[PDB]
């Protein structure tokens, strides 16, 4: 067992939650897409993400 220093997430980090959802549709016909506001949101890629 050894101790190593590297890029790692801090413990207890809830993080950012993103969920994909089905678009609006009729019984047999697909309709308008249903999406969240993720595109507007921008985050800093300081050291990358897991």
């Amino acid at each position: 067992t050894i101790t190593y220093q590297g890029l790692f997430p801090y413990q207890g980090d809830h993080g950012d939650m993103y969920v994909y959802s089905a678009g609006h549709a009729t019984g047999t016909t697909p309709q308008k897409l249903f999406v969240a506001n993720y595109s507007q949101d921008v985050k800093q890629f300081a050291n990358g993400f897991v």
């Binding site: 609006h24 009729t26 309709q31 308008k32």
Partner: protein, 212 residues
């Protein structure tokens, strides 16, 4: 977004007259149209759901017809309750859009337009605001054209039109028009004339009065 347009924005029909209302859609709405009857001073009432099935508590005379882009609402006999705004709303899209609306006016009461002119009272002159009132009473046509001419010059945007709902005794609206002028402009102005153009009336009538 889906757009719904009502073919008859306004129409005139007497009692016991069959009325057909057409709703036009840019895109197909298979069977997703809801009809609502709006009477002033009360909430709209559901009439047809899906444009195929009559809502419970709604009279049989109201009918749902048509499919896809075009839908038709038919009333076999006109009734006093039937003379109310009609809206067709698409249910196919996530945001519903209501129709332009249908307006019905009874043709039971027949009247000939009567025009009156009233000079401002002394209290209006002392206050500094002088309003001249042209009163149109018992006019059968739903819409009356009103124009103000003072000293052979037309005035626009200094007049307002207030119209009461249909009397129902003669089924005719009553309209009062007030013309407001600045004191200096009003004093130099002499004859104030309100002339109304009516399709029913043979000749537009000018009712006028001299300043003083």
């Amino acid at each position: 977004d889906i757009v719904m347009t009502q073919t008859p924005s306004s129409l005139s029909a007497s009692v016991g007259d069959r009325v057909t209302i057409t709703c036009r859609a840019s895109e197909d709405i298979t069977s997703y149209l809801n009809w609502y009857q709006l009477k002033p001073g009360k909430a709209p009432m559901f009439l047809i759901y899906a444009a195929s099935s009559l809502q419970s508590g709604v009279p049989s005379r109201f009918s749902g017809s048509g499919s896809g882009t075009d839908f038709t609402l038919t009333i076999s006999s006109l009734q006093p309750e039937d003379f109310a705004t009609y809206y067709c709303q698409q249910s196919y899209s996530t945001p519903p859009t209501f129709g332009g609306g249908t307006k019905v006016e009874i043709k039971r009461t027949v009247a000939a337009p009567s025009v009156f002119i009233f000079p401002p009272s002394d209290e209006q002159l002392k206050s500094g605001t002088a309003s001249v009132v042209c009163l149109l009473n018992n006019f059968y046509p739903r819409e009356a054209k009103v124009q103000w001419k003072v000293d052979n010059a037309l005035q626009s945007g200094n007049s307002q039109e207030s119209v009461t709902e249909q009397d129902s005794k003669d089924s005719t609206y009553s309209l009062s028009s007030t013309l407001t002028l600045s004191k200096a402009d009003y004093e130099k102005h002499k004859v104030y004339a309100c002339e109304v153009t009516h399709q029913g009336l043979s000749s537009p009538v000018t009712k006028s009065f001299n300043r003083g």
